[PDB]
Amino acid sequence: LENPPPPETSNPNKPKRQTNQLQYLLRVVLKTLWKHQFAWPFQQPVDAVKLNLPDYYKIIKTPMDMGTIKKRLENNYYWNAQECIQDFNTMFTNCYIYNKPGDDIVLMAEALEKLFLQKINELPTEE
Ligand SMILES: CCS(=O)(=O)Nc1cc(-c2cc(NC3CCNCC3)c(=O)n(C)c2)cc2c1ccn2C(C)(c1ccccn1)c1ccccn1
Ligand code: NA
């Protein structure tokens, strides 16, 4: 099995805006998770070909990763903050579905998700 193409990250047919909350999601939330010790398996799509994990995209039909989220934020792909928060949540739940509770990758994702939730509780005031 091939890898799937990565999720779309640019679309000029989508209106674009800058907002307080989107700027925070890139400059604070994504930046804080990205520089964490455990970010690295989540910084790009799961490369099922390289990892010899041919079952990965047989089960995970909404893949998501922080590389994709970073590029979506940089390309103004999201209009609403919740569209970006949904993508972080998808990344975490994908990990929790594929991998057994307590597995190394799950403990890494849980350490990132704790920090994510703290930063989402500090989202700035909407326009
Ligand atoms: C940047 C994305 S990538 O190119 O796809 N690279 C990598 C991604 C991932 C990874 C693996 C997952 N699932 C597997 C399922 C089988 N058991 C292990 C976890 C997963 O859900 N996510 C989100 C990311 C692990 C990686 C590497 C590279 C090395 N590892 C290993 C060493 C790994 C394993 C566990 C925890 C952390 N790292 C690895 C070990 C065994 C098999 C595959 N990868
Ligand atoms: Na739109």
Q: Provide the number of structural domains found in the chain.
A: 1
Q: d(Cα 32, Cα 48) in Å, to the nearest integer? A: 26
54 lines ligand 1 (CB under 6 A): no
Q: Specify the amino acid at residue 112.
A: L
Does any domain span residue 113? yes
Is residue 29 in a domain? Answer: yes
Local structure of residue 28 (DSSP, 8 states): I
Q: How far apart are CA 39 and CA 27, in angstroms?
A: 16
Q: CA–CA separation, 127 vs 116, rounded Å?
A: 22
Instruction: List C-alpha distances in Å: 66 to 15, 16, 80.
Output: 22, 20, 17
Specify if 10 maps to a domain. Answer: no
Method: X-ray
Structural domain contains residue 97: yes
Range of the domain at 43: 19-123
At how many Å resolution was this determined?
1.2
Burial profile 21-57: b = 16 or more Cβ within 10 angstroms, e = fewer: bbebbbeebbeebbeeebbebbeebbebeeeeeeebb
Provide, for the chain, the percentages of residues in helix, strand and coil under a 3-state DSSP scheme, each rounded to the nearest 5: 55, 0, 45
Distance CA 116, CA 84 (A): 12
CB 48 within 8 A of CB 3: yes
Q: What is the DSSP string of 35-67?
A: TSGGGGGGSS---HHHHT-TTHHHH-SS---HH
Tell me whether residue 14 is in a domain: no
Show Cβ contacts of residue 63 under 8 Å, excluding neighbours closer than 6 positions: 4, 7, 45, 46, 57, 94
Evaluate whether residue 4 is within a structural domain.
no
Other Cβ atoms within 10 Å of 80 Cβ, number: 13
In ligand 1, the atom with minimum distance to the C-alpha of 40 is 1
CB atoms within 10 A of CB 79: 14
Question: Which value, in Å, is the radius of gyration of the alpha carbons in the chain?
Answer: 15
Tell which one of 3, 33, 46, 90 to mutate to probe ligand 1, the residue whose CB is within 8 A of the most ligand atoms: 46
Ligand number nearest CA of 106 is 1
Question: The tokens of 30 are what?
Answer: 């994504």
For residue 11, is it within any domain? no
